Amino acid sequence: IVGGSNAKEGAWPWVVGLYYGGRLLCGASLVSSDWLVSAAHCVYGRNLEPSKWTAILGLHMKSNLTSPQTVPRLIDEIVINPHYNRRRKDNDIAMMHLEFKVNYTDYIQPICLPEENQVFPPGRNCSIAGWGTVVYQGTTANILQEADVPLLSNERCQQQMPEYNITENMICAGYEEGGIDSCQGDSGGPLMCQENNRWFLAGVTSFGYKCALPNRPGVYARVSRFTEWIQSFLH
Amino acid sequence: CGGPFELWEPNTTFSSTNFPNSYPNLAFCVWILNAQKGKNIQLHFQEFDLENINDVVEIRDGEEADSLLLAVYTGPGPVKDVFSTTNRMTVLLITNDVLARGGFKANFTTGYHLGIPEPCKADHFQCKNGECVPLVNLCDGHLHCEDGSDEADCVRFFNGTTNNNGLVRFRIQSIWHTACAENWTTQISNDVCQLLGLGSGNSSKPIFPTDGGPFVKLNTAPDGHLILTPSQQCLQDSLIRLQCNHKSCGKKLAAQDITPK
Ligand SMILES: *[C@@H]1O[C@H](CO)[C@@H](O)[C@H](O)[C@H]1NC(C)=O
Ligand SMILES: *[C@@H]1O[C@H](CO)[C@@H](O)[C@H](O)[C@H]1NC(C)=O
Ligand SMILES: *[C@@H]1O[C@H](CO)[C@@H](O)[C@H](O)[C@H]1NC(C)=O
Ligand SMILES: *[C@@H]1O[C@H](CO)[C@@H](O)[C@H](O)[C@H]1NC(C)=O
Ligand SMILES: *[C@@H]1O[C@H](CO)[C@@H](O)[C@H](O)[C@H]1NC(C)=O
Ligand SMILES: *[C@@H]1O[C@H](CO)[C@@H](O)[C@H](O)[C@H]1NC(C)=O
Ligand SMILES: *[C@@H]1O[C@H](CO)[C@@H](O)[C@H](O)[C@H]1NC(C)=O
Ligand SMILES: *[C@@H]1O[C@H](CO)[C@@H](O)[C@H](O)[C@H]1NC(C)=O
Ligand SMILES: *[C@@H]1O[C@H](CO)[C@@H](O)[C@H](O)[C@H]1NC(C)=O
């Protein structure tokens, strides 16, 4: 996130940080007591050794990991979507399993999944989160950043993104003048949209041309299409 | 980039491009492993030694332009054998522009239902992992199959307006059927809510008897396991219109304040 402010502790009890080799690389979202949902392009080529992925739940600041609210866990299974294609950047979604269960606390809560035949109308503000970068050519952010971006239509996004092929499994979000959008280092970041006092999972950060650019929105994996594929593993 | 291409049964053994010494950088090869109609592919790697995550081998099961993904292998180590499901397998080698490794070497074979073990007949239920459990783990409260398929959905809604609404359609071993509410309590209510992946039991009430199938009588027990007997002896049956709310979804329960800034 480049155009957002710091988040309050406990504001996003589902956004978790995935560390690969003592370094934050990708983000995920708590959906169950032992399962996660993240982008497949960041775990592409690392699903062979799930033990190298340590999930940090309830993370607020990247410098305070010994806090009692933080509950670290280890990954034992990484499932990449079968329809994924790194070249076309389509179906960019993957699930990661936890070794031990995590007790739901005041700072750790699972995110909600959009039900079947539930479409989000364009022009609707959906909040984002993640420990991304505050600028394109810079460094990461120690505090959990968050912002709010409005949704766009597939036709308008395809018209504004000619370098890519926006399929029906993608949902875009961003401002016309830019400035407020996610950037690199925040892969797998959720596109959280409130719906009747509930924050659904309306999108997983898939890719993007360039952040903080006018008329260059960010593309998110439409989770409403992969609802049954995610629920198949939650059982 | 311009290495080998589609092969057939007489041509199984193939290197990547220069497996004896090392593969070049920025390579993008493809080995479309064809077969006969109804014969899958079993790709066994005789040797595998590549670079880190930056160099991977993507194995697909396309059969058309809508290709799927089977496995992504990288790094040195003996990789598992990939079992296809169609008569076409696409192997993509994506390499970086530095630190070139040796390569790999694999040969495939055709057959019928390779990988998937032979399902045992004569009333033997086979879960997704292949383990056989005839009646010892057929939705009874055990975990014989390690993949969790032995506890598959033996209960679901029926004629429901929204997602979290419907009937009490159950299934003991094979046949699906509804249930009655002669001794319906909140305990079994929240039990069947949790079994369907829902929250706490809400207001549930019948309307009128309409289904004549083998209805079941749900009973409670102090040990935790539910005892149900699908007996066809009941008058003025009550079809439970199960209306149960969702689980504890992403509701911010922290002590956040109000600040429109
Ligand atoms: C972690 O949080 C505690 C809370 O008081 C603070 O004292 C400490 O300085 C923090 N550590 C870092 C590295 O920010
Ligand atoms: C979580 O809840 C279980 C069940 O009450 C309890 O045994 C356990 O101590 C709790 N904490 C952890 C870290 O599992
Ligand atoms: C979305 O948020 C922007 C500011 O970030 C605001 O100007 C706009 O009115 C909001 N849209 C809706 C529909 O609330
Ligand atoms: C996007 O892909 C679809 C599917 O092949 C194709 O029909 C369409 O013409 C493509 N659009 C662009 C702009 O490449
Ligand atoms: C196997 O490869 C040889 C060498 O190119 C070729 O002549 C032969 O036709 C191939 N066998 C097939 C395609 O079944
Ligand atoms: C690949 O070659 C090895 C070496 O003999 C062989 O054991 C294996 O069966 C081959 N894989 C096939 C035929 O799928
Ligand atoms: C469900 O709806 C179908 C639609 O015709 C009807 O035939 C059936 O009797 C209904 N079942 C119940 C239990 O209402
Ligand atoms: C409920 O259980 C009791 C247990 O004896 C039984 O007599 C009764 O017929 C059942 N049904 C109703 C509607 O009470
Ligand atoms: C049942 O659902 C309704 C829906 O608004 C809710 O108001 C009510 O509190 C729920 N009752 C219980 C017992 O959960």
Structure description:
The PDB classes it as membrane protein. The entry lists the keywords complex, membrane protein. The assembly is dimeric. The complex is a heterodimer of chains A (235) and B (261). Chain A is mainly beta and 235 residues long. Chain A has a domain of 104 residues: Beta Barrel (Thrombin, subunit H), CATH 2.40.10. Chain A is globular, with a radius of gyration of 16 Å. Chain B has a domain of 97 residues: Jelly Rolls, CATH 2.60.120.290. Chain B is 4% helix and 21% strand. Chain B contains one helix and 15 strands, in the order E-E-E-E-E-E-E-E-E-E-E-E-H-E-E-E. A four-stranded antiparallel β-sheet of chain B has the order 1-8-3-6, with no helix packed on it. In chain B, a hairpin with a 7-residue loop joins strand 13 and strand 14. Chain B is elongated. At the A-B interface, strand 12 of A face loops of B. The site of one 2-acetamido-2-deoxy-beta-D-glucopyranose has 7 residues of chain B, from strand 3.
Entry keywords:
heterodimer; A: 235 residues; Thrombin, subunit H; seven-stranded antiparallel beta sheet; six-stranded antiparallel beta barrel; 2 helices; 13 strands; 6% helix; B: 261 residues; mainly beta; four-stranded antiparallel beta sheet; 15 strands; elongated; binds 2-acetamido-2-deoxy-beta-D-glucopyranose; Enteropeptidase catalytic light chain (chain A)
